[PDB]
Amino acid sequence: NGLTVLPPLLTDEMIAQYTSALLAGTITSGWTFGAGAALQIPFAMQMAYRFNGIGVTQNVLYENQKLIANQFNSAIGKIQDSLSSTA
Amino acid sequence: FCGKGYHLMSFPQSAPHGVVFLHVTYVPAQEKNFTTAPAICHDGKAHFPREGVFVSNGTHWFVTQRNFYEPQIITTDNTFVSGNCDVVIGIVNNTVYDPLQPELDS
Amino acid sequence: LQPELDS
Amino acid sequence: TMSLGAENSVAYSNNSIAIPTNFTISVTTEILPVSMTKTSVDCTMYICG
Numbered sequence A: 001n002g003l004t005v006l007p008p009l010l011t012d013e014m015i016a017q018y019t020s021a022l023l024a025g026t027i028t029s030g031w032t033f034g035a036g037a038a039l040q041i042p043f044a045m046q047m048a049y050r051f052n053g054i055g056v057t058q059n060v061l062y063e064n065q066k067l068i069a070n071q072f073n074s075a076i077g078k079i080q081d082s083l084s085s086t087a
Numbered sequence B: 001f002c003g004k005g006y007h008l009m010s011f012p013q014s015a016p017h018g019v020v021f022l023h024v025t026y027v028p029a030q031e032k033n034f035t036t037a038p039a040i041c042h043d044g045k046a047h048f049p050r051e052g053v054f055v056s057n058g059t060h061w062f063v064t065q066r067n068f069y070e071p072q073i074i075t076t077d078n079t080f081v082s083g084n085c086d087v088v089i090g091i092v093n094n095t096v097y098d099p100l101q102p103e104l105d106s
Numbered sequence C: 001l002q003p004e005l006d007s
Numbered sequence D: 001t002m003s004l005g006a007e008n009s010v011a012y013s014n015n016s017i018a019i020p021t022n023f024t025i026s027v028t029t030e031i032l033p034v035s036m037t038k039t040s041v042d043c044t045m046y047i048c049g
C-alpha cells in the first residue's frame, strides 16, 4: 500500500487498569484520592457528603438508604439494556 | 483545575511566548485510622453532626472537622436531631452533652 | 430556652 | 513493559475512616504558550525574486 497503521502506546488492558483504579479509588475514598493520599470512608457516609454538597440535609440519606440503593441498582441495570438494544 | 490538592491561590509570572502560574495548594498529611458512625442515639433519638464526622479512638466518641483532626466533645450545638433510633443503619449509643445542664444548678 | 428556665 | 504505578488496596470497611492530622502547603508550576512569532511574507518577492 505504502500506508501503515501504528499501535497506540497503551493497550486496552492498560486502559482497563486505569478505569479500574479510578473506579476503585472513587468507591472506597471519595474525592480524597485526587486531593492527596486515598482516605477510606464507608460508602453510605460518602453519599451523605455527596447529598450535603447539593444542599439536601444528610439525615435524608440515612432515613431513605434502602430506597436510594434500590433506585441506584435499578438505574445501573437499565444502562445494560440501553446499550444492548441498539448501536 | 488550579493545581493538584485543594486550591488556595496562584501567582502569574511572565515567560517568552507564554505565562507561568505558581499554584499554592493545601495537601492533607499524616492520617490515622478511626472507628466511625453515621449517627448517635441519645434519649431514643438520632443525632447527626452539623459539620464534620463522628469518630472514636476506641473508648471515647468525638466530632471533628473532616479535613484536619480536631476532636470535640459531642453536644446539642455540635449536632442536630432527626427522628427515632430505629431507622438509621449503623447508629451507635453514646451520651450527647447539653451545655445548659450545669446552668440548671441555678 | 424559656420552658427550660421555667424549671 | 511500562508500569502504570504502585499497586494499592485501600483499607475500606463499613465502620473505618482515615482523618489527616497534619498538612503541607505545596507550590506547583504550570506553563502555557500564549502567542506565536508574528510573521509577514511578501509573496511577489518570495515567488518572483
Ligand SMILES: *[C@@H]1O[C@H](CO)[C@@H](O[C@@H]2O[C@H](CO)[C@@H](O)[C@H](O)[C@H]2NC(C)=O)[C@H](O)[C@H]1NC(C)=O
Pocket (backbone or CB within 6 Å): B057, B058, B059, B060
Ligand atoms: C480517647 O481519648 C480520651 C480523651 O483524650 C482519653 O481519655 C483520657 O484518658 C486518660 C488516661 O489515658 C485519663 O487520664 C483522662 O482523664 C481521660 N479523659 C477523659 C475525658 O476521659 C482516652 O484514654 C482515649 N482512648 C484511647 C484508646 O486512646
Ligand SMILES: *[C@@H]1O[C@H](CO)[C@@H](O[C@@H]2O[C@H](CO)[C@@H](O)[C@H](O)[C@H]2NC(C)=O)[C@H](O)[C@H]1NC(C)=O
Pocket (backbone or CB within 6 Å): B041, B091, B092, B093
Ligand atoms: C443501644 O441502647 C438501647 C437501650 O438504651 C439498646 O436497646 C435494648 O436492646 C436489648 C437487646 O440488647 C433489648 O432487649 C431491649 O428491648 C432494648 N431496649 C429498648 C428500649 O429498645 C440497644 O440494643 C443498644 N444498641 C446497640 C447497638 O448496642
Ligand SMILES: *[C@@H]1O[C@H](CO)[C@@H](O)[C@H](O)[C@H]1NC(C)=O
Pocket (backbone or CB within 6 Å): B031, B032, B033, D011, D018
Ligand atoms: C489502617 O488500618 C489497616 C488495618 O485495619 C492498615 O492496613 C492500614 O495500614 C492503616 N492505615 C493507616 C493510614 O494507618
Ligand SMILES: *[C@@H]1O[C@H](CO)[C@@H](O)[C@H](O)[C@H]1NC(C)=O
Pocket (backbone or CB within 6 Å): B089, B090, D014, D015
Ligand atoms: C459491618 O460489617 C460487620 C462485619 O464485617 C457486620 O457485623 C456489621 O453488622 C456491619 N455494620 C454495618 C453498620 O453495616
Ligand SMILES: *[C@@H]1O[C@H](CO)[C@@H](O)[C@H](O)[C@H]1NC(C)=O
Pocket (backbone or CB within 6 Å): B030, D021, D022, D023, D024
Ligand atoms: C506537621 O508537618 C511538619 C512538616 O511539614 C512538621 O514539622 C510538624 O512537626 C508536623 N506536626 C505534627 C503535629 O505532626
